[PDB]
Amino acid sequence: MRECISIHVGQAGVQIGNACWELYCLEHGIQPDGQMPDSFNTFFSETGAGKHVPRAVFVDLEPTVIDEVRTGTYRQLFHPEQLITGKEDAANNYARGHYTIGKEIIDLVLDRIRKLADQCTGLQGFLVFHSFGGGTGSGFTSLLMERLSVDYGKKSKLEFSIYPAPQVSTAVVEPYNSILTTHTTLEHSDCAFMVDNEAIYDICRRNLDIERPTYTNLNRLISQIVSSITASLRFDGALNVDLTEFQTNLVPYPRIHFPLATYAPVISAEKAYHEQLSVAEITNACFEPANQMVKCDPRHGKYMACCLLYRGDVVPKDVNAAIATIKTKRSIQFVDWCPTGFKVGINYQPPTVVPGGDLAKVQRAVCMLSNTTAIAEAWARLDHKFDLMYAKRAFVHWYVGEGMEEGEFSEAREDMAALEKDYEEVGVDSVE
């Protein structure tokens, strides 16, 4: 009844959803054929037969990552008109995602969204999975978020982005694509959840004791995040939280809407024992700076709003016993104007484990969604990676020749400079 559709843009967006829709089918007993041998209605529309299909739009400008879904295990699950392919990728070109190739199938994608929104009766919002590095996840998403705010406007549009790491990069023009995609998604997206690869590389090595983590394994941890956010919709909880409540509790200013996700417990099977995992133990794990999933130091900043989404065997008095200690600790400091920096959610359902997964079966979990000042250090790097490249006008002819103006980069950089001084304006205390 409280339906929520999802969009998957770019190669990063599809491979995340390949783990997410793997995870959702195990939480509801759903076969890969759509079979199951009433709470699943928020993601699964029902057919006339006993077959359920997901409310998902997989879009890419190149057909390779889509065809592996079309030939993979989940061939029989997805509606084949939802698996949208272009011909040529945007190919790490924001202009090709936004002007050249993206305009060719943007009317096809909005058509598939509008067919999903008509069969939804209580549609809450959107889950856009993309990245900041690739041209599709930057250009086509920013083209798409322009169109969804025109057609809907008041729906709560959520993004789950793959933020580019400080020292770990896979593409050279990642500083170009990330600045350009944020200048457009700023006035449109309501709350964009940053996720970094290097921090999950830190977590999969240390916390999971995996020597060699794969992109299969990183997408499992992002799936546990998005499942725990929509756990209160898909299941009955002791204290529920809707997607409309997240943008209310976490976004103090319309510019600052970039929290960073954090999941706990992340332990292997050999460490599934040897600790009891109380709600005090898993909550102190989240505010520990080594366990976050964006490479930022929260001790170098201040939290503005934290959102603890518990699930499973969770006792609400022990929740308050866990949380009230953290406000006393000096390493967790808040901003002066925010005495109430907490939103707490509890679900009765534990997170299940995917077979072949690296996480272990735990009785309780927590998905921290914390908006902090410490992300301003991440944007201070990314402008510094931008200002070194753009001063020599590197790679600009790849973007000018695809329809973009050279003066548009000065618009995106000065606006990002205006976004950078917003955290400095919020991060200071109040006079008198």
């Binding site: 057909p63 390779t64 030939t71 011909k87 041209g135 593409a171 290097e198 794969t214 590197a394």
Partner: protein, 429 residues
């Protein structure tokens, strides 16, 4: 989708491609006849990029083989995998270039180029959505330099939005293989800077070292050199033909590696390269494949990268491997060699991983390096050019074919306009 039309020019471009279509047919499990005989459907999933499907469940290569003499094509069509090509594609003349750029670009090339482009236009319309054209030729010869660079100027006018990557065998520092190769190179680099989106400089002197030092081959033939070139060539488009965990293509390697539209002259590298005995005494890990690429003795372009700075670096990997193990090593070579990479491009390493390995290997890498180290490649040729041109030596074999001295004065100034740009962005802060 995203189909590639392979064009071969010159004796060298044919002998590379005849080994190149040996590798592609072995990767896709294709017999000498043209029929599929692999095991998995992943080989036929993206079969259409280098192949048209003919009737009777046979595949023909989407290749256009061009020469000016019939001596090389008769070696192609009679050898192994020569019966797979369409006999319409062999567009050869009779006169031969005579190891001359002017005879390849003006006189004998123009009497054949209209019969080539009609085969190009026939193969381009047979493509569903064309990705772009790859060309294999040399810069020392006459056909690969003349007829090859004549094909680029005609195609870019007809197909401007497509990528035009050339695999140019650039002449060597120590030895020559042609007396007029400073004339054939400089007149071709004039045509490469204006009409190619990227160009992979390969030197035969460098492959002589890699076959001797690294592979421990005492007697390497041309068939052993071209298998190292074709391992790069299939490794560039291996993410376009197969699923990977981070897919690249010819446009991702174009945008990431070309910061300025003239500066698109690359050096390739391949890893692993082991001998017969020396392969069981080595662990094939991603930190081993990483450190084998970024040294000097694995560069297929005969210039030490330590004399310059890498502008941009692409590392296309093949086989099942872990991304952290990749992304640590791509970071690891940037920290310890921060003076060796250019400073004003932070994080100048492009990463690509294909899931399908080469045949008989657990994992493999394909290095694409864009450095300022190839300014010495053009400092040497422009010095060898100016030494010959100031005496007007061999000028009458080109002046007699419709050319003036003003063509040389522009082409030599264009290369010194190119050398001054690599020197500009090497000293840039």
């Amino acid at each position: 989708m995203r189909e590639i039309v392979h064009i071969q020019a010159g004796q060298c471009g044919n002998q590379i491609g005849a080994k190149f279509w040996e590798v592609i047919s072995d990767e896709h499990g294709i017999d000498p006849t043209g029929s599929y005989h692999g095991d998995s459907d992943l080989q036929l999933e993206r079969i259409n990029v280098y192949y048209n499907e003919a009737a009777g469940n046979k595949y023909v290569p989407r290749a256009i083989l061009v020469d000016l003499e019939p001596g090389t094509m008769d070696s192609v069509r009679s050898g192994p995998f020569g019966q797979i090509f369409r006999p319409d594609n062999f567009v050869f003349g009779q006169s031969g270039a005579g190891n001359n750029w002017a005879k390849g670009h003006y006189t004998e090339g123009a009497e054949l180029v209209d019969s080539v482009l009609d085969v190009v236009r026939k193969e381009s319309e047979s493509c569903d959505c064309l990705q772009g054209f790859q060309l294999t030729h040399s810069l020392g010869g006459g056909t690969g330099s003349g007829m090859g660079t004549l094909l680029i100027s005609k195609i870019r006018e007809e197909y401007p939005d497509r990528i035009m990557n050339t695999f140019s065998v650039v002449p060597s520092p120590k030895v020559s293989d042609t007396v007029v190769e400073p004339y054939n190179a400089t007149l071709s680099v004039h045509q490469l800077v204006e009409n190619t989106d990227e160009t992979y400089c390969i030197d035969n002197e460098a492959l002589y070292d890699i076959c001797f030092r690294t592979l421990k081959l005492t007697t390497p033939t041309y068939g052993d050199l071209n298998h190292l070139v074709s391992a790069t060539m299939s490794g560039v488009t291996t993410c376009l033909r197969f699923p990977g965990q981070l897919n690249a293509d010819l446009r991702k390697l174009a945008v990431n590696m070309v910061p300025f539209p003239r500066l698109h002259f690359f050096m390739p590298g391949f890893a692993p390269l082991t001998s017969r005995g020396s392969q069981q005494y080595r662990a094939l890990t991603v930190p081993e494949l990483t450190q084998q690429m970024f040294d000097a003795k694995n560069m297929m372009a005969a210039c030490d990268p330590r004399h310059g700075r890498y502008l941009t670096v692409a590392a296309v990997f093949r086989g099942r491997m872990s991304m952290k193990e990749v992304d640590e090593q791509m970071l690891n070579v940037q920290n310890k060699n921060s003076s060796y990479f250019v400073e004003w491009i932070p994080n100048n390493v492009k990463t690509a991983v294909c899931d399908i390995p080469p045949r008989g290997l657990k994992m493999s890498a394909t290095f694409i390096g864009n450095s300022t180290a190839i300014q010495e490649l053009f400092k040497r040729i422009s010095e060898q050019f100016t030494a010959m041109f100031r005496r007007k030596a061999f000028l009458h074999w080109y002046t007699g074919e419709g050319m003036d001295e003003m063509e040389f004065t522009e082409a030599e100034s264009n290369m010194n306009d190119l050398v001054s740009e690599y020197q500009q962005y090497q000293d840039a802060t």
